Amino acid sequence: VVGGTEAQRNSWPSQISLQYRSGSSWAHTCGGTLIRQNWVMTAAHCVDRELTFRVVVGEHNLNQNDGTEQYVGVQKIVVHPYWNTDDVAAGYDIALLRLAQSVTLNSYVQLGVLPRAGTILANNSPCYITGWGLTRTNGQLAQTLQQAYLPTVDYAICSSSSYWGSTVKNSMVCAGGDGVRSGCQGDSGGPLHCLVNGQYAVHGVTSFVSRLGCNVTRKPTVFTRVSAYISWINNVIASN
Ligand SMILES: [Xe]
């Protein structure tokens, strides 16, 4: 997250760190949202590589003991069947991870609330991106979970020529684009949390930014629109 602030420890308890085994250690690679005690929602592109993955829930600082973490292996990966790794712009950037164990819920570990199917946010709706991704274009991962306030940019504006044009689909949510704050590498797969009727819900799964950089004016961060995938999500969980 570029232009973020440090999240309070208990603000976003559905945020997870998706990590891969790297020698004798583990490396953060993406975010995710805990949606059942044994299922995480993330981006398909996060799991294209043939790596060994684990999830950390109750994580705040990637590099220090928080006293709240639970570490769990990924048992099964279900990518959206229409995902194509060479065409992120086509959409379908979503995947579900079945965890080897069911995690325990508490003030640091909670299920993310998902929007009702079909819900589209009005232009300029209040949302926060969260993650441990790069804090500058071509920078380094954050140590502590970051948040940034990124208002939505509706499909009409986002798909206009000076924004993303044809690259953005109605199965996506755009947010931000102010040139100061944005998602960045390592935020992929994580939540976009939007306040609706007094409650935050996870409306987006972080998918991409501009090849030119993270915080680029009129290139808002682009997310998979969760409310487009509610039936798919339910179908996977019910058959697995
Ligand atoms: Xe990203």
From Swiss-Prot:
Major site of localization recorded for this protein: secreted
Subcellular location: Secreted
Domain Peptidase S1: 1-238
Enzymatic class: hydrolase
Keyword Protein transport: no
Enzyme Commission code: 3.4.21.36
Protein residues bound to Ca(2+): 59, 61, 64, 69
InterPro entries linked to this entry: Peptidase_S1_Elastase_sf, Peptidase_S1_PA, Peptidase_S1_PA_chymotrypsin, Peptidase_S1A, Trypsin_dom, TRYPSIN_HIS, TRYPSIN_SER
Disulfide cysteine pairs (residue numbers): 30-46, 127-194, 158-174, 184-214
Example of a GO biological process term: proteolysis
Keyword Ribosomal protein: no
GO terms for MF: metal ion binding; serine-type endopeptidase activity
GO cellular component terms attached to this protein's record: extracellular space
Keywords of the record: Calcium, Disulfide bond, Hydrolase, Metal-binding, Protease, Secreted, Serine protease, Signal, Zymogen
Family (UniProt): Belongs to the peptidase S1 family. Elastase subfamily.
Alphabetized PANTHER family for the sequence: CHYMOTRYPSIN-LIKE ELASTASE FAMILY MEMBER (PTHR24257), CHYMOTRYPSIN-LIKE ELASTASE FAMILY MEMBER 1 (PTHR24257:SF0)
Function: Serine proteases that hydrolyze many proteins in addition to elastin.
Protein's recorded name: Chymotrypsin-like elastase family member 1
Species the sequence originates in: Sus scrofa (Pig)
Gene this chain is encoded by: CELA1
